[PDB]
Amino acid sequence: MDGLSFVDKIPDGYKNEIDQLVKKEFANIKADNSVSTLTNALYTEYLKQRNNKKRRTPDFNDDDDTLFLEEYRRKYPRIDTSRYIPNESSEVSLLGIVDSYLKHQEIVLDTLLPQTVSNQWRINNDYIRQTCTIVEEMNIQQRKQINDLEIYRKRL
Amino acid sequence: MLCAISGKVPRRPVLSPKSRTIFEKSLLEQYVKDTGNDPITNEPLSIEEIVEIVPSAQQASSIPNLLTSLQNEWDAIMLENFKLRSTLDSLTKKLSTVMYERDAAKLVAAQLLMEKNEDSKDLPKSSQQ
Amino acid sequence: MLCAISGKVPRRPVLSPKSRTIFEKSLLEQYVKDTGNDPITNEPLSIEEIVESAQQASLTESIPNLLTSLQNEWDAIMLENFKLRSTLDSLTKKLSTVMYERDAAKLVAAQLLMEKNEDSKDLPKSSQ
Amino acid sequence: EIAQQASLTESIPNLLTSLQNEWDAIMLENFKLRST
Amino acid sequence: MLCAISGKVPRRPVLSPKSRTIFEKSLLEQYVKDTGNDPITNEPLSIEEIVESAQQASLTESIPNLLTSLQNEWDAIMLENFKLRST
């Protein structure tokens, strides 16, 4: 479990060599109603349900159902002029105030980025001191071992 | 479709303009002639304070519930997306913690194989001589 | 500034007193009626426990709200969740490939811990 | 500030064109009552 | 966007859980250290009661705001019929 990361200064060939050892072991071991049914089918087919574009299609000198269509166009134009009249009265001002709301929301995300960045550096900073201390304990252990191997041959 | 004095289906639904509760014309009038008060909140109430008719005038007794049905089905869509993203990020933590630890445990083998190899050549050159 | 259920920008935000997380009113009222608890922390919460302006500039070309805007909303709802179900199925497959290679590496270290220390022990016995 | 019965329409792409028809009818049921 | 106590743009917003209102942290902390209360409704509120997930959000633009838009379309058209019925 103990693998030093900052201490071990591990080639890419060792990553390929260790992965083959892992791969060799790997070879050995070897809530809705009907709206969900429509939404899953439409996305799987990738096809969208068609809307009514008949109001764009209407033409003069046509039958009684199309007389209903042209009067529908008159009610849509009166509503469209009323909707355009509200926007003109509001002015850009209304588009301006929603833009100020977006800058405040955007700034909150950037502060969350610094908070996470400060904390992930702190977890790394605590780990770096532990690795250097684990380095000297391992290095002193290796030096004592190389002394004992040399001494035992010298005594014999 | 219930009166708030006896509990019968109101055939002439009247209401007091002090505490909003639909009563029946017979029972609330018998309460007011008893004591001049509202039965629910015990506030001041009279006979002329009562509103006593079916209200339908200039109104002409569909569209609106279809938008309410469209609100209700979106309400399920939002709750489903929350539980679906919650399970996404929770196993992504399990995916991340495993893959980092797998490569961390992978570095254990690269260190351990090289030390095992050093003990092989050390002993063989020693046991030969 | 956002809702912690849907990912909305709420019009009537309400906050809970057991865990302070700002939710839209309709979504939090739906959860307490389903199972009477806070969705985040799973603590006891009721409708009376909850404690109660945003501008969207409508486009100049606002027929399109019936036709073109409403189809794009139910297209983007349909394609995203299906792609999200495709995202949830792939990670559970990648979870299985993570743990199997993890348990494969555990058997390497378990095998090699017996190899290394006995190889070092035979070096100590070699001196005698 | 002073019976609620939920509509259960039928056994979703048809409900889109149903809404399209009802706004189409209401616009004509409003227009005919104005010219009158 | 504003702090209800001062009127400035808060650089550290905290929302209280007794009267929902966006207060600036350094201002409301001094209000709580003065007396243990919420400045709007004068209900009890402590420092731990004042508080500054995974589903990503997008900006409120012209599904939910589209459904509330068609409410405004029809509730205005309903008043247009009354101008006709009374005339």
Swiss-Prot record, chain A:
Keywords: mRNA processing, mRNA splicing, Nucleus, Spliceosome
Disulfide bonds listed in the record: none
Keyword DNA repair on entry: no
A cellular component annotation (GO) from this entry: Prp19 complex
Segments passing through the bilayer: none
Cell location: Nucleus
Superkingdom of origin organism: Eukaryota
An example Gene Ontology biological process: mRNA splicing, via spliceosome
Other known facts: Present with 721 molecules/cell in log phase SD medium.
Quaternary structure annotation from Swiss-Prot or TrEMBL: Belongs to the NTC complex (or PRP19-associated complex), composed of at least CEF1, CLF1, ISY1, NTC20, SNT309, SYF1, SYF2, and PRP19.
Biological role stated in the UniProt entry: Involved in pre-mRNA splicing by stabilizing the NTC (or PRP19-associated complex). As a component of the NTC complex, associates to the spliceosome to mediate conformational rearrangement or to stabilize the structure of the spliceosome after U4 snRNA dissociation, which leads to spliceosome maturation.
Protein name: Pre-mRNA-splicing factor SNT309
Organism: Saccharomyces cerevisiae (strain ATCC 204508 / S288c) (Baker's yeast)
UniProtKB/Swiss-Prot annotation, chain C:
Domain U-box span(s) in chain numbering: 1-62
Interaction with CEF1 as annotated region, ranges: 63-120
Disulfide bonds, paired cysteine numbers: none
Annotated compartments: Nucleus
Required for self-association: annotated span: 54-128
Top-level taxon of origin: Eukaryota
Further information: Present with 11700 molecules/cell in log phase SD medium. The tetramer is an elongated particle consisting of four globular WD40 domains held together by a central stalk.
Function: Probable ubiquitin-protein ligase involved in pre-mRNA splicing. Acts as a central component of the NTC complex (or PRP19-associated complex) that associates to the spliceosome to mediate conformational rearrangement or to stabilize the structure of the spliceosome after U4 snRNA dissociation, which leads to spliceosome maturation. It is also probably involved in DNA repair.
Family listed: Belongs to the WD repeat PRP19 family.
Known partners and oligomeric status: Homotetramer. Component of the NTC complex (or PRP19-associated complex), composed of at least CEF1, CLF1, ISY1, NTC20, SNT309, SYF1, SYF2, and PRP19.
Name listed for the protein in its UniProt record: Pre-mRNA-processing factor 19
Record organism: Saccharomyces cerevisiae (strain ATCC 204508 / S288c) (Baker's yeast)
Residues of the full protein shown: 1 to 142 of 503
